[PDB]
Amino acid sequence: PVMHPHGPPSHRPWQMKDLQAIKQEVSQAAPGSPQFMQTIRLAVQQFDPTAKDLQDLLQYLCSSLVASLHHQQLDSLISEAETRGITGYNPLAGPLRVQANNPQQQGLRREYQQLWLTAFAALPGSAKDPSWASILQGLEEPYHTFVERLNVALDNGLPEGTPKDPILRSLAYSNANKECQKLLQARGHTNSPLGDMLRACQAWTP
């Protein structure tokens, strides 16, 4: 992090307590999901991290594969942004990442943080086996409990700005047990269909 005294800027290493608190706030959110993004967005604001700090934070929160995909995307976003013009970037003063580690280069650091943040958008979709696809209703699970069970896994797994209602509707079916799955040819029809698949199983005697 880069410290801002009340009365020059200086870098200080991450404190494990702060990293730990970030991971606990991210909770079960997958990289790119809303909770994940709000968390690391708040962290970048609070700690004004350098490029090196951001690399430590990445490896603490995400798997080694995810970290590599992030690096690939971030490199492309960097190249593209260089053409448009990066504030504080002297192409003759060495690699941009080295420059972003100079705590005096605030503008350049703030730009790098924003590209670092934006890079997470491309990460989902490269995960073809999310956990929310696995959540499946057992022969014993109630239906009303299962629909919420899927809602949270989608809340934690789906990237930002992605439809969830059309996902849960199919998932509340494709991932339901064969027990209650037989009430799904006369499925009720409403405006928000979700209210129906529950009406069908609003009362389900085992």
Author numbering: 1 to 7, 9 to 207
Kindly provide excerpts from the paper associated with this entry.
Human T-cell Leukaemia Virus type 1 (HTLV-1) is an untreatable retrovirus that causes lethal malignancies and degenerative inflammatory conditions. Here, we show that high-resolution crystal structures of the mature-length HTLV-1c CA protein define essential lattice interfaces and identify a distinct ligand-binding pocket. Across the known Orthoretrovirinae, CA is a two-domain protein with HIV being the best characterised. However, our structures reveal that HTLV-1 does still have a pocket formed between helices 3, 4, and 5, albeit an electropositive one capable of binding to either phosphate or sulfate in vitro.
The full-length HTLV-1 CA protein was solved to a resolution of 2.25 Å in space group F222 with three molecules in the asymmetric unit. To improve the CA full-length structure, we re-solved it by molecular replacement searching for three independent copies of the refined CACTD structure as a search model. In the HTLV lattice, the NTD mediates both intra- and inter-hexamer interactions. The CTD is excluded from the NTD plane, but also contributes inter-hexamer interactions through CTD dimerization. This results in a closer-packed lattice for HTLV, with a distance between hexamer centres of 74.6 Å, nearly 20 Å shorter than that of the HIV lattice (92.0 Å). While there is currently no equivalent structure available for the HTLV-1 mature CA lattice, the comparison strongly suggests that our HTLV-1c CA crystal structure packing most closely resembles the immature lattice. As such, it is plausible that the full-length HTLV-1c CA crystal structure represents a maturation intermediate.
